[PDB]
Structure 1
Amino acid sequence: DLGKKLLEAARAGQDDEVRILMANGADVNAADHYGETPLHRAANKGHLEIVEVLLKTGADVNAKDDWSGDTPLHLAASHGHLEIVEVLLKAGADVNAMANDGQTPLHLAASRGHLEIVEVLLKHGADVNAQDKFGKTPFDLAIDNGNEDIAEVLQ
């Protein structure tokens, strides 16, 4: 299965294999046990190159996994992959998409401390007043985690 190979190449960082497998008609949205696509895996690990390649081939930038309901944008926001966050948003990722816990990439970046990403998400048009299913806004999460710099930006 070329899709399973694409999934493994995506997290491995083998952008050569990614391009080749897609040239051979690999499923760009192939899903693994947790429902994650090669794009999810590339975004998770930080393989910007693979992320771009997959999107060029026609990866679903707004695909959500089947476990936590996170998009590649959610994953990049959490881990701190600023460069990938930018690309995904330019590709057309929904900046206010929520996961299964109702958290947006902004919720994640705010709670993680990724001020740089918070700023980008805000500039794109993220809703700083969006509550998650815990009743918290990204601002609230920034306050809870002592991220005053982020809190000031979100305020």
Structure 2
Amino acid sequence: PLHLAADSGHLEIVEVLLKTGADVNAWDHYGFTPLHLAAHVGHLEIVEVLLKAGADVNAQDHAGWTPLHLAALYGHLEIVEVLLKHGADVNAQDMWGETPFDLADIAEVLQKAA
């Protein structure tokens, strides 16, 4: 569903899911958040449209990857801020005890957001 629709990033797929779906409300066999799945696969509009219906920025997975963590890890300058403005912003913790500053340009954004 949203997990696969958050890879290629069709407008039609996410729009059909916008009318009906299980938005920001599922975990696949791996446990990824489909929202930040779409975030680190490297989209913008899919992530924002799924924010305006889910409004979630902190959600963990099997390894503890909250969106901010691996957003800082993957070196995405703008989508991290896009999740910062909408859905608000809160820092979180993974299972190894790592902060998004260490994984991360993004670190400076972390200081001003926090």
TM-score (norm 2): 0.85
> Aligned residues, how many?
110
Work out whether residues 2 and 17 of structure 2, in 8 Å CA contact, stay in contact via their aligned partners in 1.
Answer: yes
Equivalent residue in structure 2 for 1:133, among 91, 95, 107: 95
Q: 1:1-155 to 2 correspondence within 5 Å?
A: 38-67=1-30, 69-124=31-86, 125-128=88-91, 130-142=92-104, 149-155=105-111
Higher relative contact order (CA 8 A, sep 6+): 2
- Structure 1 gaps, min length 5: 1-37, 143-148
Report the secondary structure of 2:78's partner residue. Answer: helix
Work out whether residues 62 and 93 of structure 1, in 8 Å CA contact, stay in contact via their aligned partners in 2.
Answer: no
Distance in 2, matches of 1:52 and 1:137, equals 34
Deviations 1:14-73, CA, capped at 9 Å, x for gaps: xxxxxxxxxxxxxxxxxxxxxxxx211010222232012112123333211122x11211
Distance in 1, matches of 2:23 and 2:81, equals 24
Deviations 1:119-153, CA, capped at 9 Å, x for gaps: 1122232223x1211211112211xxxxxx11100
Work out whether residues 73 and 93 of structure 1, in 8 Å CA contact, stay in contact via their aligned partners in 2.
Answer: no
Distance in 2, matches of 1:43 and 1:123, equals 20
Work out whether residues 23 and 53 of structure 2, in 8 Å CA contact, stay in contact via their aligned partners in 1.
Answer: no
- Structure 2 gaps, min length 5: none
Report the secondary structure of 1:127's partner residue. Answer: coil
| Structure of larger gyration radius | 1
Work out whether residues 96 and 104 of structure 1, in 8 Å CA contact, stay in contact via their aligned partners in 2.
Answer: yes
Query: More helix per residue: 1 or 2?
Result: 1
Distance in 2, matches of 1:51 and 1:59, equals 11
RMSD over aligned Cα atoms: 1.5
Distance in 2, matches of 1:123 and 1:58, equals 24
TM-score (norm 1): 0.65
The amino acid that maps onto 1:101 is A
